[PDB]
C-alpha cells in the first residue's frame, strides 16, 4: 500500500456556517458527502463550513465513493483575518492523490464500472493532466465526459452515404497492409490457386487464430502513457475508458480468436475462408490434451450463410478441398437427426453449412437437438451484416452460438447505422465493447451528439487489431492495383423453354416455315419477306413471354406473407386440434386440410362448396362476392394452404390456381434473389426491346420480390422530363438496405441517360444490330470505376434468339450498313432468312 499525488484543483467555496475564530491559512480541510451538494468540512471544529459550486460538486461527488482509490485532500488558500460571514468565499486548493487501491487492482456490473471510469476521467480533466505521445504525428485525444466536448448539431444513428464513405476512409485506411506475408497452402490439401492478396489474408487469418504452425517465421491503442508530477519510476499507464491503471506498461496481446474479414466484393473472401479451413480444421491442442492424459466439437467448422448461397458454399468447398478425410455437409430441413452427437462423435464432419433461418428457427423453439448444446471449433458468418439488428431473433440466435474461433465475412459491415458494428463486436465478444453500456457511452452517445470523430477513433481503435480490409482500388508494392477491373464482363446464359412454352413456340415455327415454303414455291422468297418477319417476330416474343402475342392473380408475395400472418393469428395453436368452419354448409371441421379453400379476405370454405358458388354465379354472369361477408372476391385470389404444412413455420397461404411465369422472368428472378445477399445496394439495369415486356417485368418483379429489399423503377419514356430525371435521381440514390432496378427500353438506349451507378445489366432479348446493344452496355462503365459491369444475356436455346446472335456476329465482321444496289441487297435479305431457319 502506498499513495501518490497527481494534481491539484483551485476553486472557491461558499460559506455555510460562521467561524468564531478565523480558520488558519494552512487548514487541513476535508470533504463530506452530504443539482448536487457536496459539503466542505474542517478537521478541527468538526462542523460544516461550505457548499461547493455545481460544476465542482459534479467532479467531487462521485469520487468520494472511491475514497480508498482516489483521496481528495483540500487545503485552505486565503484567510482575510476575519470570521467567515454567511456567504463569504472560501478559496481552496484540492490536492488529488492516487492510492494503490485504485491502481493495478483490476455479474453485469457495467454501471458500477463505468461510473468509476467516468468520475476518474472527469478528475483528470479538472487537474488537466495529459498523456505523452511518441510519434511524429500525435494520436487520439482522451474521450470526454457526458454532456461535454462541445455537444452540438444532434445527429441520428442512421448514416448518410457521405457519412458512410467517411467511416470507411479511416478503418480501411489503416497503416500499410501491403507487407502482410503470403502463406501458400500446399496442393496436398488444397487444389486452388490463391491470389497475392488471398495468400496475405490466409496468413493474417492464421495469425488471428494464433496458428503459428502454418507460418514461415512471421502498443495497445486504447491505453495511453501518463506522467507523474513532482511537487509535494517516472511514468504510469492507464486506460481512462475502463478506469484501469498499471504501474508497468500493459502489453496485453490480442485475446479473441479470429476476427472480421471485411473486403470489397471481388477479393475472394469465400476462397480465403476455405483456405483457412483446409489449413486448420481442428484444435490440435485439444486432441493432444485428451489422449496424453464434454460438449466441445474440436473438429467441426460451422458456416452460417444466406439461403441463396447455401449450395454455392458446399460447391466451392468441394472444388477447393483435396483431403478426402475432412467432409462437408449441409444441415438443412432437419436432415441430421442428432447433430449434437454427430459433431461430437467419432465421425464428426469437418464443415457444416447452414442458414441463418435455421439458426433462427432452432433458437426460437429451444431446439436441444444441436447447434446450441455444442461449442463449435470455428464459426464463420458469411454476409455477417445480417445480425446487424441487435433486436431481431436472428441476431439473438447467432450471438447465442458458442465456438472457440469466430469469423465474420462481410463486404459491408455497416449498412445504414453505426451500431451495426455492435453486434459484430457482440458476436466476437470483445470485452468490454461486447457490453452495450460501454458502446452507448463511448461511441453511440458521442456520435448521436455530433462528436463523430470522437466515436470513429474509438471504433477504429477496437476493430484495428481484429478487422482486415483491402480494396480493389489499392496499389500493390510493385505498383499495380490488387484487382485489374475490366470495363465489362458479358455472359450469355442459355435457357430452355417450359413444357408449355415449347408447344407454343413449335406452333409459331410451323407458320414461319410454311410462309417460307410459300414464297420459295412462288419463285421468289422475298415475295413473303414482310409476312416472314411477322412470324419471326412472334417467335421472338414467345421466347420472352407468351402474353406478348394477344386470369392473373392480383396478390403479391408481400401480401401473401401478410395474409398468412393474419391466418396464423386467427387460427392459433391451443389444447385442441385446429379446425376450420365453412361459411356455406356450416361444417365445424373441414377435412382434409388440403380441401380448405381460403378467400382473399381470410374466410374458410370447403373447396367444393366455394367452387359450386363461383360456378353458379358465373353461369348467371353475376358479380362474385364472399358468401360470408359480401366482399369482392376474385377467383384468381382464392387461396389454399401449402402442402405439406411446415411445423416450424405454420400455415402458409399460396394461390389456389397456379400462374404462368416465362422462362426468362424465372431466370431473372433467380439472379435477383441471389444478388440481394451477394452485394447490398447494387443498381441493376434491365434492358428489353419490347415495351410491353417491360410492363410485364415490372408487374412480375414487384409481385415476387419484397418491397423493402428490391425497388423497381421503370422508364415509361412517356413522362415529363422532370419525372424521368427524378427516377434517375432516386436510382442513383445508393441504399445498401435494398437493391434498385431500372427497367428501360433497349430501343431508346441510354442516350442522354446517366447509368454510371449501375454495376449489373440484364439483356432480356437480342436485336438485329450488335451496335445498339453494345452502345447501351457501354454507357454504364466509365474508366475509373470501383466495379466492373457484369452483363448477362438471356438466350433461349435452339431458338431464333440464338440465330439473331449469329446475325450480330456477322454484322460485327462486316458492318451494319454495307451499301449496295438492290442486286447486292437481296442476297443479304435472303442470307439473313437462311440464318434464321437453318
Ligand atoms: Hg363446405
Ligand atoms: Hg369474406
Ligand atoms: Hg451462320
Curated annotation (Swiss-Prot):
Full-sequence range covered: 174 to 1114 of 1114
Residues that, per the record, bind ATP: 263-270
Enzyme Commission number: 3.6.4.-
Location in the cell: Cytoplasm; Nucleus
Residue ranges occupied by any Helicase C-terminal domain in the UniProt entry: 667-838
Chief localisation class: cytoplasm
Helicase ATP-binding domain boundaries: 250-431
Protein's recorded name: DNA repair protein RAD5
An annotated GO cellular component: nucleus
Record-stated family: Belongs to the SNF2/RAD54 helicase family.
Origin superkingdom: Eukaryota
Keyword Nucleotide-binding: yes
Gene: RAD5
Key words of the record: ATP-binding, Cytoplasm, DNA damage, DNA repair, DNA-binding, Helicase, Hydrolase, Metal-binding, Nucleotide-binding, Nucleus, Zinc, Zinc-finger
Function of the protein: Probable helicase, member of the UBC2/RAD6 epistasis group. Functions with DNA repair protein RAD18 in error-free postreplication DNA repair. Involved in the maintenance of wild-type rates of instability of simple repetitive sequences such as poly(GT) repeats. Seems to be involved in maintaining a balance which acts in favor of error-prone non-homologous joining during DNA double-strand breaks repairs.
One GO biological process term: DNA repair
One of the record's GO molecular function terms: DNA binding
Residues in RING-type zinc fingers: 582-630
Keyword field contains Zinc-finger: yes
Motif (DEGH box) on chain: 382-385
Amino acid at each position: 500500500r502506498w499513495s501518490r499525488y497527481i494534481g491539484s484543483i483551485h476553486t472557491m467555496g461558499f460559506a455555510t456556517r460562521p467561524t468564531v475564530k478565523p480558520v488558519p491559512i494552512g487548514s487541513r480541510l476535508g470533504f463530506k458527502k452530504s443539482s448536487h451538494l457536496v459539503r466542505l468540512i474542517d478537521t478541527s471544529q468538526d462542523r460544516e463550513l461550505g457548499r461547493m459550486p455545481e460544476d465542482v460538486a459534479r467532479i467531487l461527488y462521485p469520487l468520494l465513493d472511491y475514497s480508498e482509490q482516489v483521496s481528495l485532500e483540500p487545503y485552505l488558500l486565503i484567510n482575510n483575518g476575519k470570521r467567515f460571514s454567511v456567504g463569504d468565499n472560501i478559496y481552496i486548493r484540492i490536492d488529488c492523490y492516487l492510492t494503490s487501491q485504485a491502481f493495478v487492482r483490476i455479474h453485469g456490473m457495467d454501471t458500477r464500472q463505468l461510473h468509476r471510469a467516468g468520475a476518474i476521467m472527469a478528475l483528470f480533466d479538472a487537474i488537466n493532466i495529459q498523456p505523452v505521445y511518441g510519434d511524429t504525428k500525435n494520436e487520439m485525444i482522451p474521450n470526454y465526459q457526458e454532456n461535454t466536448v462541445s455537444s452540438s448539431q444532434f445527429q441520428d444513428e442512421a448514416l448518410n452515404i457521405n457519412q458512410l464513405k467517411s467511416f470507411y476512409r479511416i478503418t480501411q485506411s489503416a497503416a500499410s497492409l501491403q507487407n502482410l506475408p503470403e502463406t501458400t497452402p500446399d496442393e496436398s490439401l488444397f487444389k486452388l490457386q490463391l491470389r497475392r492478396y488471398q495468400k496475405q489474408s490466409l496468413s493474417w487469418m492464421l495469425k488471428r487464430e494464433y496458428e503459428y504452425s502454418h507460418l514461415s517465421e512471421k502498443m495497445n491503442p486504447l491505453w495511453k502513457k501518463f506522467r507523474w508530477p513532482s511537487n509535494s519510476d517516472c511514468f504510469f499507464y492507464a486506460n481512462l475508458y475502463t478506469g484501469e491503471f498499471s504501474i508497468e506498461k500493459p502489453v496485453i496481446k490480442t485475446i479473441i480468436n479470429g476476427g472480421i474479414l471485411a473486403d470489397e466484393m471481388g477479393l475472394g473472401k469465400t476462397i480465403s475462408a476455405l483456405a483457412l479451413i483446409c489449413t486448420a480444421s481442428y484444435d490440435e491442442a485439444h486432441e493432444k490434451k485428451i489422449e496424453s492424459t464434454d460438449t466441445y466439437a474440436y473438429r467441426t467448422t460451422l458456416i452460417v450463410v444466406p439461403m441463396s448461397l447455401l449450395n454455392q458454399w458446399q460447391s466451392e468447398f468441394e472444388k477447393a478441398n483435396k483431403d478426402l478425410k475432412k467432409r462437408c455437409e449441409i444441415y438443412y430441413g432437419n436432415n441430421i437427426k442428432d447433430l449434437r452427437a454427430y459433431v461430437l462423435g467419432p465421425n464428426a464432419p469437418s464443415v457444416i453449412i447452414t442458414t441463418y433461418g435455421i439458426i433462427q428457427s432452432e433458437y426460437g423453439r429451444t431446439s436441444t437437438s444441436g447447434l446450441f448444446n455444442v461449442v463449435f471449433f470455428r464459426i464463420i458468418l458469411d454476409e455477417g451484416h445480417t445480425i446487424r439488428n441487435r433486436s431481431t431473433r436472428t441476431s439473438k440466435a447467432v450471438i447465442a452460438l458458442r465456438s472457440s474461433r469466430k469469423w465474420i465475412l462481410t463486404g459491408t459491415p455497416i449498412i445504414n447505422r453505426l451500431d451495426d458494428l455492435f453486434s459484430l463486436v457482440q458476436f466476437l465478444n470483445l470485452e468490454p465493447w461486447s457490453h452495450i453500456n460501454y458502446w452507448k457511452r463511448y461511441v453511440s452517445v458521442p456520435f448521436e451528439k455530433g462528436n463523430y470523430a470522437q466515436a470513429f477513433d474509438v471504433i477504429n481503435a477496437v476493430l484495428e487489431p481484429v478487422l482486415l480490409r483491402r480494396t480493389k482500388n489499392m496499389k500493390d508494392v510493385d505498383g499495380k492495383p490488387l484487382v485489374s477491373l475490366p470495363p465489362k464482363e458479358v455472359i450469355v446464359e442459355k435457357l430452355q423453354l417450359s413444357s408449355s412454352e415449347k408447344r407454343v413456340y413449335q406452333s409459331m415455327l410451323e407458320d414461319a416455315e410454311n410462309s417460307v415454303k410459300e414464297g420459295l414455291a412462288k419463285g421468289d422468297l422475298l415475295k413473303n419477306y414482310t409476312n416472314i418477319l411477322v412470324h419471326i417476330l412472334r417467335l421472338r416474343q414467345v421466347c420472352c413471354h407468351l402474353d406478348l402475342l394477344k386470369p392473373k392473380s392480383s396478390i403479391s408475395q408481400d401480401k401473401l406473407d401478410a395474409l398468412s400472418a393474419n391466418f396464423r393469428d386467427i387460427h392459433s395453436a391451443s389444447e385442441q386440434l385446429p379446425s376450420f368452419e365453412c361459411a356455406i354448409c356450416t361444417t365445424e371441421c373441414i377435412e382434409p386440410l388440403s380441401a380448405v379453400s381460403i378467400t382473399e379476405c381470410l374466410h374458410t370454405f370447403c373447396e367444393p362448396c366455394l367452387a359450386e358458388y363461383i360456378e353458379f354465379q358465373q353461369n348467371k354472369k353475376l358479380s362474385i362476392n364472399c358468401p360470408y361477408c359480401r366482399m369482392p372476391i376474385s377467383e384468381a385470389n382464392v387461396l389454399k394452404l401449402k402442402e405439406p404444412i411446415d411445423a416450424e413455420r405454420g400455415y402458409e397461404l399460396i394461390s389456389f390456381h397456379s400462374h404462368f411465369q416465362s422462362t426468362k422472368i424465372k431466370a431473372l428472378l433467380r439472379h435477383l434473389k441471389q444478388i440481394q445477399e451477394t452485394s447490398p445496394g447494387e443498381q441493376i439495369i434491365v434492358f428489353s426491346q419490347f415495351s410491353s415486356f417491360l410492363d410485364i417485368l415490372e408487374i412480375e418483379l414487384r409481385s415476387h420480390l419484397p418491397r423493402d429489399q428490391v425497388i423497381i423503377y421503370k422508364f415509361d419514356g412517356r413522362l415529363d422530363m422532370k419525372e424521368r430525371t427524378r427516377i434517375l435521381e432516386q436510382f442513383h440514390d445508393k441504399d445498401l438496405s435494398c437493391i434498385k432496378l431500372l427497367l428501360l427500353s433497349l430501343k431508346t438506349g441510354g442516350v442522354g441517360l446517366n447509368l454510371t451507378c449501375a454495376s449489373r445489366a440484364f439483356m432480356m432479348d437480342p436485336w438485329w444490330s450488335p451496335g445498339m446493344e453494345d452502345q447501351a452496355i457501354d454507357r454504364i462503365h466509365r474508366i475509373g470505376q470501383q466495379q466492373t459491369v457484369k452483363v448477362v444475356r438471356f438466350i433461349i436455346d435452339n431458338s431464333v434468339e440464338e440465330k439473331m446472335l449469329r446475325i450480330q456476329e456477322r454484322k460485327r465482321m462486316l458492318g451494319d450498313i454495307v451499301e449496295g444496289d438492290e442486286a447486292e441487297r437481296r442476297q443479304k435479305r435472303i442470307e439473313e432468312i437462311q440464318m434464321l431457319f437453318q
